[PDB]
C-alpha cells in the first residue's frame, strides 16, 4: 500500500523497511525546474547542496560493496557493546528514530569496519580464486 | 549471532539549517520565483512526535534578510532624489477657516535644477510637516538630508503583499505540527509534513498584525518567557477583527521633470473632503475579543489579578504609533483609542486619528531612506487584524500591558512557528541475523 | 617651529566647498601634504 513520503516514519524498523523506496526517490527528488536577484543564487546553492548531500553518502555505499542498496548484508559481526538488545526488542519494538538515539554513539566506529574489513578481504581472495 | 547490516532510505532526521527558496503562483518583488505545484502534498505522520521551538527557528532570520534584500534591489534601478536637498521656502496652507486640519502641509517653493542643467525653475510642492523641518515665509529642509540620501520608489512597482511559499531542497523536510495547542515550544502529539509552506504575505506592520492566519480553539498566548517583562507577548486571534482605514483626499500629482531624463512626482493640489485620515473599528467586536485575550491572561497570572491596557511609552513615532502600508501610502495611527481599558479581578465604533508620511525608514535601518510617491486620488482600504504585539510593564495584583514592535522578525515568526526544517540521513545500520556468502 | 627643520611639507589650504546644502557653500580648510597637491600654473 502506498503510504506517501515518510509514511512509515511512525512505525517499527521492521515495518518501515517495507517502503524504503517511497522515501528514497525524494532524497534527491529532482525536477524543481535583471540578473542575480534574491533566490537567483539561492535556488542555485540549494540545488547543488542537494546533489552533494546525496552523493557524499551514496559513495560510501559504493565503497561498502553493495550498490544494490536500501538493504544488504556484510561479513562484519555485531559487537555486543553496541546496545545489547534482542531482535524482538529491536526490530519489533522500536522506530528508526529511537534506534539512532542509541546507536548514533558508535557511528564512526562501526563505519570503520564497514569502510574496511570485508572490502579489504573479500578481494585478494578472489584474485587468488582466479589463479585457476 | 548478529551481524552488521546496512540500510538506506531510513526515515530519520536531525534539526539543521539550510538555504530555503521561494515559490508563488505565476507588483512587489516576486517574479524570479518557481511556480507552486497545483497539488501541494502533505501527510499526516501517526506515532510521530517531537519538539518544536519557534524561538530558535532560523527560518525567520533568512526570511527577514531576504525580504530586505528584495527591497533594496527594487529601488536601485529607480530614480534618486539627490538634488531635492535644497532650502525650502514654505508657508501655511489656509484650510477651511478657522482650523480643524491644523494645516499639516506647507505650500513650499524652491529654485529647482531641471533637465536644462543651467537655467533653473522656481517650482512648488505640498509636503507634510512630518517630512520637513525648519532650518535655524520660513526656511525648511527635507528631514532625510541630515542622515542620508533618498531614492524615489518607482511609480510602476507596488507594495502589495503577495503570498510566498517556502521550500527546502532534497534531503531536507518541511515539518508541520497540526496541534491546535502550542506553548511556543515542546512536543507535538500530532505532527505532519508538507512539500512546502502555505502562502505567507510579507505584511510589514507594528503593534497590530494584519492579514495573518487565524488560531483554532482559544486565543493563543506565546512568549519566550512570560514571567520576564524584558520579553514580549504574541497574541493570535480566533476571529478576524475588521479595520477600515481611509484617506479622503482626491489629490493630484504635479509631476516635475527634474531630469535630465528622470522624472519626479511632486504633490499637486489637495481637494475634496478635507478631513484627517483615520481608521474605523467595530467597538463591540474589539471589546469582545479583548476580553477573550484577558481570559488567557488570567490563565497565566491568576484568578485574582487586575489587567490594564494602555498606549506605548512614547518616543520614536515609528514605535509609538501603529505603522502600516496601504496602496503605497504609509500610515501612522494613534492606537490610544484601542489600547485603553481595564479588567477587574475575576454602532458602536472607534475612530483612530492617523498621519501620513512620505519619507520613511525600513526595518529600523539607518543610512538610507525611501520616498513614497503621492498616490493620486482617494485612498481607502480594509484588512483583518489577526494578532497583537504586546509588552509587559508593587507587583501583587495589577499589571499593565502595551503595544510594541520594532523588530519585524517578530512578524515573520508569528507565522513560521508552525514550521521547522530537518535534515534527512538516509544511511543507517542495524544488527541482523545474516552472514553474507561469495 | 622657527626656523625650519620640518620644511613645512604641509600647506594650510582653504577652499569654497559644496556642503550638504547644495546651494550655499562653505569656506573650509585642511592640511595636505605637498606630495598630494601641486601648484596650478597665497597660491
Ligand atoms: C467596514 O467596511 C466594511 C466593508 O469593507 C463594511 O461592510 C459592510 O458591513 C455591513 C454590516 O455587515 C453590511 O451591511 C449589511 O448589508 C446587507 C446587504 O447589503 C447589500 O444588499 C442590500 C440588499 O440585500 C442592498 O440594499 C444594499 O445596498 C447592499 O448592496 C443589508 O442587508 C444589511 O441591512 C440590514 O442591516 C442594516 C444595518 O447594518 C439595517 O439598516 C437594514 O435595515 C437591514 O436590517 C446591512 O446593510 C454591508 O453590506 C457591508 N459592506 C460590504 C461592502 O460588504 C462595514 O460597514 C465597515 N465598517 C465601518 C465602521 O464603516
Ligand atoms: C502507530 O502506533 C500504533 C500504536 O500506538 C500502532 O498500532 C497498531 O496498529 C495495528 C493496526 O491497527 C494493530 O495491528 C493489528 O492488531 C491485531 C491484534 O494484535 C491483529 O489481529 C492484526 O493482524 C493487526 O496486527 C496493532 O495491534 C496496533 N498496536 C497496538 C499497540 O494497538 C500502529 O501500528 C502504529 N503505526 C506505525 C506506522 O507504526
Ligand atoms: C531662487 O529663489 C530665491 C529665493 O528663494 C531667489 O533669491 C533672490 O536671489 C537674489 C540673488 O541672490 C536676491 O537679489 C538681490 O537682493 C539684494 C537685496 O534685495 C539686492 O540688493 C540685489 O540687487 C539683488 O536683487 C534676492 O533678494 C533673493 N530673494 C530673497 C527672497 O532672498 C532667487 O532669485 C531665485 N531664483 C530664481 C531663478 O528665480
Ligand atoms: C502655492 O504656491 C504656488 C507657487 O509656488 C502658488 O501658485 C500660484 O497658483 C495660482 C493658482 O494656480 C496662480 O494664479 C493664477 O495665475 C494666473 C496667471 O498669473 C492668473 O491668470 C490666474 O487668475 C491666477 O492668479 C499663480 O500664478 C501661481 N503662482 C505661480 C508662482 O505660479 C499658489 O498660490 C500657492 N498656494 C498658497 C495657498 O499660497
Ligand atoms: C525568565 O526570565 C526572567 C528574567 O529575564 C528570569 O528571572 C530571573 O530569575 C532568577 C531566579 O528567580 C533571578 O535570579 C536571582 O536574582 C537575585 C537578585 O538579582 C539574586 O540574588 C539571586 O542569586 C538570583 O540570581 C533573576 O534576578 C531574575 N531576573 C529578573 C529580570 O528578575 C527567569 O529565570 C527566566 N526563565 C527562564 C526559564 O530562563
Ligand atoms: C499615552 O497616553 C499617555 C496618557 O495616558 C500619555 O502620557 C503623557 O506622557 C508624557 C510623557 O511621559 C507626559 O509629558 C510630560 O509631562 C510633564 C508634565 O506635564 C512635562 O513636564 C513634560 O515636558 C512632558 O510633556 C504627559 O504629561 C503624559 N500625560 C499624562 C496624562 O500623564 C502619552 O503621551 C501617550 N502616548 C501617545 C503616543 O500619545
Ligand atoms: C493620542 O490621542 C490622545 C487622545 O485620545 C491624545 O491625548 C492627549 O495626550 C496629551 C499627553 O498626555 C494630553 O496633553 C496634556 O494635557 C494636560 C491637560 O490638558 C496639559 O496639562 C498638558 O500640558 C498636556 O497638553 C492631552 O490632554 C490628551 N488629550 C486628551 C483627550 O486626554 C494624544 O495627544 C494623542 N497622540 C497623538 C500623537 O496625537
Ligand atoms: C570662495 O573663495 C574665493 C577665493 O578663493 C572667493 O573669491 C572672491 O570671489 C569674488 C566673486 O568672484 C571676488 O569679488 C569680486 O572682486 C572684484 C575685484 O576685487 C570686485 O571688483 C567685485 O566687486 C567683487 O568683490 C573676489 O575678489 C574673489 N576673491 C579673490 C581672492 O579672488 C569667493 O568669494 C569665495 N566664496 C565664499 C562663499 O566665500
Ligand atoms: C589655517 O587656515 C585656517 C582658515 O582656513 C585658519 O583658521 C583660523 O584659525 C584660528 C584658530 O582656530 C581662528 O582664530 C580664532 O578665531 C576666533 C574668532 O574669530 C577668535 O575668537 C580667536 O581669538 C582666534 O583668532 C580663526 O578665526 C580661523 N579662521 C577662520 C577663517 O575660521 C588658521 O589660522 C590657518 N593657519 C595658518 C598657520 O595660517
Ligand atoms: C567491542 O567493542 C568494544 C569497544 O566499543 C571493545 O571494548 C574493549 O573491550 C576490552 C574487554 O573488555 C577492553 O580491554 C578494552 O579496553 C575495551 N575497549 C574500550 C574502548 O573500552 C571490545 O573489544 C569489542 N569487541 C570486539 C570483538 O572487537
Ligand atoms: C502658521 O500658522 C501657525 C498656526 O497654525 C502659526 O503658529 C504659531 O507659530 C508661532 C511660532 O512657532 C508660535 O509662536 C504660535 O504660538 C503658533 N500658534 C499656534 C496656534 O500654535 C504660525 O505663526 C503661522 N505662520 C504664519 C506666517 O502666519
Ligand atoms: C539630524 O537631524 C535630526 C532632525 O532631522 C536631528 O534630530 C534631533 O536630534 C536631537 C538629539 O537626538 C533631538 O533633541 C531632536 O529632537 C531631534 N529632532 C527630531 C526632528 O527628532 C539631529 O540632531 C541631526 N543631526 C545633525 C548632526 O545635526
Ligand atoms: C478576514 O478573515 C476572514 C476569516 O475569519 C476571511 O473570511 C473569508 O471570507 C470569505 C468572504 O466571506 C469567504 O469566502 C471565506 O470562506 C471566509 N473564510 C472563512 C475562514 O470563513 C476574510 O477573507 C478575511 N479578510 C481578509 C481581507 O483577508
Ligand atoms: C481559575 O478558576 C477557574 C474557575 O473559576 C478554574 O477553572 C477550571 O479550569 C480548568 C482548566 O480549564 C478546568 O479543568 C476546570 O473544569 C475549570 N473549572 C470550572 C469551574 O470550570 C481554574 O482552574 C482556576 N485557576 C486556578 C489557578 O486555580
Ligand atoms: C480612556 O478611555 C476612557 C473610556 O474607556 C475615556 O474615559 C473618559 O474619560 C473622561 C475623563 O475621565 C470622561 O470625561 C469621559 O466621560 C470618559 N468616558 C467614559 C466612556 O466614561 C478616556 O478619555 C480615555 N483616554 C484616552 C486618552 O482616550
Ligand atoms: C533477550 O530477550 C530474552 C527473551 O527473548 C530475554 O530473556 C532477555 O532478558 C533479553 N535480553 C535482555 C538484555 O534482557
Ligand atoms: C552517547 O555518549 C554520549 C557521551 O559520549 C552521551 O552524552 C550520551 O548519553 C550517549 N548515549 C547513549 C545512548 O548512552
Ligand atoms: C466590554 O464588555 C464588558 C462585558 O463583556 C464590560 O465589562 C466592559 O464595560 C465593556 N466595555 C465597553 C466599552 O462597553
Tab-separated table of C-alpha atoms in Angstrom, chain B residues 54-298:
chain	number	residue	atom	x	y	z
B	54	UNK	CA	9.773	28.891	17.437
B	55	UNK	CA	12.285	30.997	19.363
B	56	UNK	CA	15.313	29.404	17.709
B	57	UNK	CA	13.704	28.853	14.307
B	58	UNK	CA	16.252	30.241	11.845
B	59	UNK	CA	13.668	30.214	9.049
B	60	UNK	CA	12.657	33.612	10.416
B	61	UNK	CA	16.165	35.048	10.128
B	62	UNK	CA	16.539	34.040	6.476
B	63	UNK	CA	13.093	35.318	5.505
B	64	UNK	CA	13.826	38.630	7.214
B	65	UNK	CA	17.098	39.341	5.411
B	66	UNK	CA	15.729	38.020	2.113
B	67	UNK	CA	12.840	40.498	2.222
B	68	UNK	CA	15.317	43.285	2.994
B	69	UNK	CA	17.472	42.265	0.029
B	70	UNK	CA	14.423	42.295	-2.249
B	71	UNK	CA	13.538	45.789	-1.040
B	72	UNK	CA	16.929	47.255	-1.956
B	73	UNK	CA	17.046	45.516	-5.345
B	74	UNK	CA	13.675	47.023	-6.257
B	75	UNK	CA	14.973	50.535	-5.562
B	76	UNK	CA	18.398	50.542	-7.199
B	77	UNK	CA	17.023	50.851	-10.706
B	78	UNK	CA	14.777	53.726	-9.675
B	79	UNK	CA	15.298	57.484	-9.631
B	80	UNK	CA	17.448	59.001	-6.913
B	81	UNK	CA	16.239	62.277	-5.418
B	82	UNK	CA	19.646	63.713	-4.515
B	83	UNK	CA	19.019	67.189	-5.935
B	84	UNK	CA	15.895	67.676	-3.812
B	85	UNK	CA	18.043	68.597	-0.813
B	86	UNK	CA	17.656	72.377	-1.068
B	87	UNK	CA	16.413	75.247	1.120
B	88	UNK	CA	12.614	75.292	1.003
B	89	UNK	CA	10.519	78.462	1.208
B	90	UNK	CA	7.276	77.455	2.897
B	91	UNK	CA	4.026	78.960	4.163
B	92	UNK	CA	0.840	77.838	5.921
B	93	UNK	CA	-1.987	76.436	3.828
B	94	UNK	CA	-5.297	78.168	4.552
B	95	UNK	CA	-7.614	75.201	5.056
B	96	UNK	CA	-11.278	75.921	5.523
B	97	UNK	CA	-11.380	78.559	8.223
B	98	UNK	CA	-10.785	78.514	11.019
B	99	UNK	CA	-8.562	75.465	11.554
B	100	UNK	CA	-9.524	71.833	12.240
B	101	UNK	CA	-6.968	70.299	9.878
B	102	UNK	CA	-4.102	72.130	11.554
B	103	UNK	CA	-2.547	72.558	8.115
B	104	UNK	CA	-0.118	69.659	8.338
B	105	UNK	CA	1.189	70.583	4.903
B	106	UNK	CA	3.150	73.582	3.653
B	107	UNK	CA	2.993	75.304	0.266
B	108	UNK	CA	6.743	75.053	-0.276
B	109	UNK	CA	8.575	76.540	-3.265
B	110	UNK	CA	12.208	76.426	-4.392
B	111	UNK	CA	14.685	77.055	-7.193
B	112	UNK	CA	14.944	73.613	-8.738
B	113	UNK	CA	17.509	72.262	-11.194
B	114	UNK	CA	15.726	70.963	-14.293
B	115	UNK	CA	16.643	68.970	-17.398
B	116	UNK	CA	18.421	72.090	-18.611
B	117	UNK	CA	21.380	71.921	-16.259
B	118	UNK	CA	21.917	75.634	-16.308
B	119	UNK	CA	18.750	77.692	-16.099
B	120	UNK	CA	16.720	76.678	-13.049
B	121	UNK	CA	12.976	76.678	-12.444
B	122	UNK	CA	11.005	78.005	-9.474
B	123	UNK	CA	8.577	75.220	-8.587
B	124	UNK	CA	6.352	74.220	-5.673
B	125	UNK	CA	5.012	71.128	-3.921
B	126	UNK	CA	2.899	70.235	-0.888
B	127	UNK	CA	4.866	68.496	1.859
B	128	UNK	CA	3.802	67.083	5.221
B	129	UNK	CA	5.362	68.780	8.251
B	130	UNK	CA	6.432	65.300	9.325
B	131	UNK	CA	8.773	65.224	6.322
B	132	UNK	CA	10.260	68.717	6.587
B	133	UNK	CA	11.941	70.697	9.362
B	134	UNK	CA	12.692	74.389	9.895
B	135	UNK	CA	16.270	75.479	9.184
B	136	UNK	CA	17.771	77.504	12.034
B	137	UNK	CA	7.926	82.650	4.791
B	138	UNK	CA	10.494	80.493	6.560
B	139	UNK	CA	13.252	78.107	5.519
B	140	UNK	CA	12.714	74.342	5.737
B	141	UNK	CA	14.612	71.139	4.979
B	142	UNK	CA	13.831	67.572	3.911
B	143	UNK	CA	14.441	65.618	7.101
B	144	UNK	CA	16.392	62.830	5.391
B	145	UNK	CA	19.173	65.129	4.179
B	146	UNK	CA	20.812	65.232	7.598
B	147	UNK	CA	21.099	61.445	7.699
B	148	UNK	CA	21.463	60.109	4.156
B	149	UNK	CA	20.373	60.283	0.516
B	150	UNK	CA	16.819	59.436	-0.526
B	151	UNK	CA	15.517	57.472	-3.513
B	152	UNK	CA	12.124	57.739	-5.207
B	153	UNK	CA	10.207	54.472	-5.399
B	154	UNK	CA	9.193	53.717	-8.982
B	155	UNK	CA	5.586	54.631	-9.770
B	156	UNK	CA	5.073	51.309	-11.511
B	157	UNK	CA	6.224	48.978	-8.740
B	158	UNK	CA	3.738	48.315	-5.943
B	159	UNK	CA	3.973	47.195	-2.320
B	160	UNK	CA	1.019	44.802	-2.210
B	161	UNK	CA	1.963	41.809	-0.016
B	162	UNK	CA	1.901	38.590	-2.058
B	163	UNK	CA	1.581	35.057	-0.575
B	164	UNK	CA	5.003	33.388	-0.609
B	165	UNK	CA	5.665	29.670	-0.172
B	166	UNK	CA	8.981	28.356	1.154
B	167	UNK	CA	10.543	25.065	0.075
B	168	UNK	CA	13.511	23.007	1.260
B	169	UNK	CA	15.977	21.288	-1.115
B	170	UNK	CA	16.074	17.495	-1.483
B	171	UNK	CA	17.315	15.792	1.675
B	172	UNK	CA	15.518	18.322	3.845
B	173	UNK	CA	11.929	18.095	5.049
B	174	UNK	CA	9.341	20.698	5.987
B	175	UNK	CA	7.703	19.517	9.203
B	176	UNK	CA	4.359	20.928	10.301
B	177	UNK	CA	2.503	20.288	13.522
B	178	UNK	CA	-1.276	20.356	13.299
B	179	UNK	CA	-1.697	20.543	17.053
B	180	UNK	CA	-4.172	23.345	17.750
B	181	UNK	CA	-2.408	23.765	21.092
B	182	UNK	CA	1.132	25.118	21.321
B	183	UNK	CA	3.036	26.935	24.046
B	184	UNK	CA	5.676	28.170	21.619
B	185	UNK	CA	7.871	25.127	22.226
B	186	UNK	CA	7.738	21.459	23.205
B	187	UNK	CA	6.484	18.080	21.922
B	188	UNK	CA	3.557	17.907	19.483
B	189	UNK	CA	1.297	14.807	19.672
B	190	UNK	CA	0.070	15.468	16.124
B	191	UNK	CA	2.853	16.086	13.602
B	192	UNK	CA	2.513	16.090	9.818
B	193	UNK	CA	4.796	17.067	6.937
B	194	UNK	CA	4.425	19.070	3.727
B	195	UNK	CA	6.267	19.706	0.479
B	196	UNK	CA	6.242	23.464	1.075
B	197	UNK	CA	4.737	26.049	3.427
B	198	UNK	CA	1.393	27.794	2.978
B	199	UNK	CA	1.283	31.202	1.313
B	200	UNK	CA	2.550	33.832	3.736
B	201	UNK	CA	2.104	37.513	2.906
B	202	UNK	CA	5.091	39.721	3.825
B	203	UNK	CA	2.970	42.284	5.678
B	204	UNK	CA	5.033	44.946	7.441
B	205	UNK	CA	3.354	46.483	10.489
B	206	UNK	CA	3.957	47.468	14.107
B	207	UNK	CA	1.809	46.882	17.198
B	208	UNK	CA	-1.053	45.292	15.262
B	209	UNK	CA	-0.712	42.253	12.991
B	210	UNK	CA	-2.621	42.374	9.702
B	211	UNK	CA	-3.910	39.750	7.252
B	212	UNK	CA	-2.272	36.839	9.060
B	213	UNK	CA	-3.528	33.357	9.902
B	214	UNK	CA	-6.186	32.522	12.495
B	215	UNK	CA	-5.839	30.390	15.620
B	216	UNK	CA	-8.110	27.473	16.492
B	217	UNK	CA	-9.765	26.730	19.853
B	218	UNK	CA	-8.988	29.693	22.107
B	219	UNK	CA	-6.837	32.825	21.880
B	220	UNK	CA	-3.153	31.921	21.781
B	221	UNK	CA	-0.563	33.404	24.116
B	222	UNK	CA	3.052	32.791	23.153
B	223	UNK	CA	6.189	34.253	24.766
B	224	UNK	CA	9.862	33.320	25.121
B	225	UNK	CA	9.423	33.900	28.855
B	226	UNK	CA	6.058	35.025	30.216
B	227	UNK	CA	7.495	35.901	33.631
B	228	UNK	CA	10.255	38.023	32.101
B	229	UNK	CA	8.945	41.507	31.309
B	230	UNK	CA	12.081	42.192	29.295
B	231	UNK	CA	10.461	39.909	26.718
B	232	UNK	CA	7.171	40.339	24.869
B	233	UNK	CA	3.916	38.537	24.134
B	234	UNK	CA	2.435	37.273	20.871
B	235	UNK	CA	-1.362	37.157	20.759
B	236	UNK	CA	-3.101	35.307	17.921
B	237	UNK	CA	-6.821	35.860	17.362
B	238	UNK	CA	-9.563	33.361	16.590
B	239	UNK	CA	-11.791	35.699	14.595
B	240	UNK	CA	-10.784	38.391	12.105
B	241	UNK	CA	-11.225	41.888	13.533
B	242	UNK	CA	-12.182	44.212	10.677
B	243	UNK	CA	-10.415	47.559	10.406
B	244	UNK	CA	-11.290	50.095	7.704
B	245	UNK	CA	-8.916	52.988	7.063
B	246	UNK	CA	-9.457	55.972	4.774
B	247	UNK	CA	-7.650	58.934	3.234
B	248	UNK	CA	-10.368	61.241	1.850
B	249	UNK	CA	-8.169	63.395	-0.402
B	250	UNK	CA	-8.735	63.409	-4.200
B	251	UNK	CA	-5.286	64.979	-4.724
B	252	UNK	CA	-3.350	65.351	-7.974
B	253	UNK	CA	0.252	64.630	-8.959
B	254	UNK	CA	2.022	67.662	-10.420
B	255	UNK	CA	4.964	65.642	-11.711
B	256	UNK	CA	8.022	67.814	-12.332
B	257	UNK	CA	10.654	66.932	-14.926
B	258	UNK	CA	13.690	67.385	-12.695
B	259	UNK	CA	15.883	65.467	-15.091
B	260	UNK	CA	17.858	65.302	-17.106
B	261	UNK	CA	15.616	62.496	-18.289
B	262	UNK	CA	14.490	61.185	-14.922
B	263	UNK	CA	11.151	62.417	-13.595
B	264	UNK	CA	9.967	63.320	-10.100
B	265	UNK	CA	6.415	63.011	-8.823
B	266	UNK	CA	5.646	66.007	-6.618
B	267	UNK	CA	2.395	66.716	-4.782
B	268	UNK	CA	-0.112	68.663	-6.874
B	269	UNK	CA	-3.209	70.036	-5.152
B	270	UNK	CA	-5.412	68.663	-2.379
B	271	UNK	CA	-9.162	68.787	-2.994
B	272	UNK	CA	-12.285	67.039	-1.737
B	273	UNK	CA	-13.339	66.111	1.785
B	274	UNK	CA	-10.566	67.793	3.761
B	275	UNK	CA	-10.713	65.513	6.808
B	276	UNK	CA	-7.833	63.852	8.687
B	277	UNK	CA	-7.188	60.286	7.610
B	278	UNK	CA	-8.455	57.790	10.158
B	279	UNK	CA	-9.458	54.198	10.787
B	280	UNK	CA	-12.834	52.694	11.658
B	281	UNK	CA	-13.015	49.865	14.179
B	282	UNK	CA	-16.070	47.913	15.324
B	283	UNK	CA	-16.060	48.722	19.032
B	284	UNK	CA	-18.166	45.861	20.404
B	285	UNK	CA	-16.026	43.434	18.400
B	286	UNK	CA	-12.832	44.852	19.898
B	287	UNK	CA	-14.267	44.687	23.404
B	288	UNK	CA	-15.389	41.101	22.927
B	289	UNK	CA	-12.076	39.865	21.526
B	290	UNK	CA	-10.046	41.814	24.067
B	291	UNK	CA	-11.996	40.027	26.760
B	292	UNK	CA	-11.136	36.681	25.214
B	293	UNK	CA	-7.483	37.724	25.344
B	294	UNK	CA	-7.790	38.677	29.022
B	295	UNK	CA	-9.180	35.228	29.758
B	296	UNK	CA	-5.821	33.838	28.694
B	297	UNK	CA	-4.017	36.297	30.544
B	298	UNK	CA	-5.978	35.268	33.621
